[PDB]
Amino acid sequence: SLPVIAAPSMWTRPQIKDFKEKIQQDADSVITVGRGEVVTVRVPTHEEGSYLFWEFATDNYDIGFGVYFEWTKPLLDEIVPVYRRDCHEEVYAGSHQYPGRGVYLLKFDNSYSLWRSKSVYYRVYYTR
Amino acid sequence: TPAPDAINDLLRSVDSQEVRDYCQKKGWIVIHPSNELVVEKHI
Known part of the structure; x- marks a missing residue:
């Protein structure tokens, strides 16, 4: 069977x-993240790692947030669908179990914003 | 050492800077240095 991909947690x-x-x-x-821009942050799976944990926040405005997984042309899986979050009001956080070796793509999506730049504060950890 | 999904359940339920720092001390979680992360911009 192809790898089953665990659902992500978000809080x-x-x-x-x-x-x-x-x-x-x-x-x-x-x-x-400039007007109309999308910034991607690449987070490789660590060789000793099991899970990816992320946290993020913005200053004055919301921003779109999504998570994809790149398998090491290359196959891309949707982990967290991109959707606008009010991470200017609260810290947004989440996690996902490694489906295998590869690279996570954290996407901070400001495509929709014509007139506003966003400042993004983020942090990521991994577990053994 | 606990299981990754146990760490997960803890952080999900009682998340705080303090709980993070504790998990970090125990080496349960390890921070990814941001300067090692590849950042890409696209319009």
């Missing part, structure tokens, strides 16, 4: 001020 947590303060302590964890 929020309220402390967005503290989250962004923590993340701001490193420049590279802060992304500017």
